[PDB]
Ligand binder design. Structure first.
Ligand SMILES: OCCC1CCC(=C(c2ccc(O)cc2)c2ccc(O)cc2)CC1
Ligand SMILES: OCCC1CCC(=C(c2ccc(O)cc2)c2ccc(O)cc2)CC1
Lengths: 10, 235, 235, 11
């Protein structure tokens, strides 16, 4: 899992 | 189908200008960093905060949101340091011989020797800013260039992105034609701007190379986000 | 200078006749294939290619007007870029394969260097889809030579003279495209597309360089290649 | 000095 993954959703 | 292609050149410009991230400040204290520890401390802290704004800026770049989540991740992982640097170079335009990392963090070559191993990179950034200055680079052009960097740098590692890139090309020409440039001046200036992108890439590569070196990792604790952006370029 | 007086057709003619030859490798199909053995062949090939490249550079319009120190710097900066775009040009008509030499045609299979291979493959397919012409190719390669190290050098009108020659090559590219029947919009778009690829070329060069002075510390490197590699000195 | 320097010189 990536932080960038999460940040691009919200 | 994407909405980005249906936009006009003036609409493309307005969208990019409106999506512009803010100019962030460095941590205060009269500081005047003269060691690589404090210097890199300020830079990495600033970069980490800029990254959060960049991610949300990218989502407002026409055509980017049309990509899958994975493709969005790839492009950002690939271009983030390029985007940080062209922003830095842009801010530093009206400060010859100096780099404006933040309105309260303006540095010259002498301080750029404190990090070292990267003073060439410091000089390359100064040279790029000077180049933008002599070309009288406009804000509308800058936001086009930054958009191109985002979509192009990882476009390989597909017709949709290339179609948006063509759109930005149409936009760049539209701005120059609006500025009253002749046909020959238009394609000449277009070439001049895009060739600088090759230099932007070079500074990012060399810049990255030092940043994810184990020694530079150990200098000052980096954020988990900044670390994951670095690890994406792991060799 | 004399390069500034050249017409577009004269420029193309000059670049075409200055083209280096396609060198053979020492590859033997009977011989066991592996990495390091492959890298040994490519090292030997690149070293001989460099000699032709140096003398090719002398025939590039405007290059001999430069000081000897500046000629050295430009070649030191761009040599791998120039090799790679030549490689990519050779491999256009060979989908999924890189034609390092007429007797050395390799696919993906025969991890970090694998991604360099794929990037070279992607660039080659990009040229194929665009149907890049030989006249366009020699312009791009010349642009790389003059541009890659132009911001990494008082008083020097050298930089200014280079930019004027670069402008002339841009004029030449546009002239070729207009002769191909492309509309103005198509000309600007194609010009942008070509120059954006140069960014990827720079990227591949930097990554390739990294792997080259990583294994140097471990394949033997020729005396010239070592010196060219040493120019990209930083860790 | 360097090899590149020598080859660029050779008339
Ligand atoms: O010698 C100069 C050192 C370089 C190191 C890399 C670099 C950085 C940078 C520095 C550290 C880091 O973790 C990420 C980026 C930079 C910081 C903020 C920006 O807005 C733009 C770039 C710029 C200068
Ligand atoms: O798949 C990874 C192998 C890459 C390594 C770097 C590279 C090389 C290259 C290979 C070794 C070397 O010492 C210098 C360059 C190359 C050789 C000849 C050319 O005409 C163009 C490039 C190309 C391929």
């Amino acid at each position: 899992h990536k932080i960038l993954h999460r940040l691009l959703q919200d | 189908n994407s909405l980005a292609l249906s936009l006009t050149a003036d609409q493309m410009v307005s969208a990019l200008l409106d999506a512009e991230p803010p100019i962030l400040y460095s941590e205060y204290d009269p500081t005047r960093p003269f060691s690589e520890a404090s210097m890199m401390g300020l830079l990495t802290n600033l970069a980490d905060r800029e990254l959060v704004h960049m991610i949300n800026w990218a989502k407002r770049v026409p055509g980017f949101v049309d990509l899958t989540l994975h493709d969005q991740v790839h492009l950002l992982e690939c271009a983030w340091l390029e985007i940080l640097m062209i922003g830095l170079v842009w801010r530093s335009m009206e400060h010859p011989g100096k780099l404006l990392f933040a309105p309260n963090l303006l540095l010259d070559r002498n301080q750029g020797k404190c990090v070292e191993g990267m003073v060439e990179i410091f000089d390359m950034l100064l040279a790029t800013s000077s180049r933008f200055r002599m070309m009288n680079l406009q804000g509308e052009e800058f936001v086009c260039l930054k958009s191109i960097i985002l979509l192009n740098s990882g476009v390989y590692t597909k017709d949709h992105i290339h179609r948006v890139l063509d759109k930005i090309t149409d936009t760049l020409i539209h701005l120059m034609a609006k500025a009253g440039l002749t046909l020959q001046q238009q394609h000449q200036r277009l070439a001049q701007l895009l060739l600088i992108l090759s230099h932007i890439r070079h500074m990012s590569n060399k810049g990255m190379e030092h940043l994810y070196s184990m020694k530079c990792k150990n200098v000052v604790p980096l954020s988990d986000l900044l670390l994951e952006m670095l690890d994406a370029h792991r060799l």
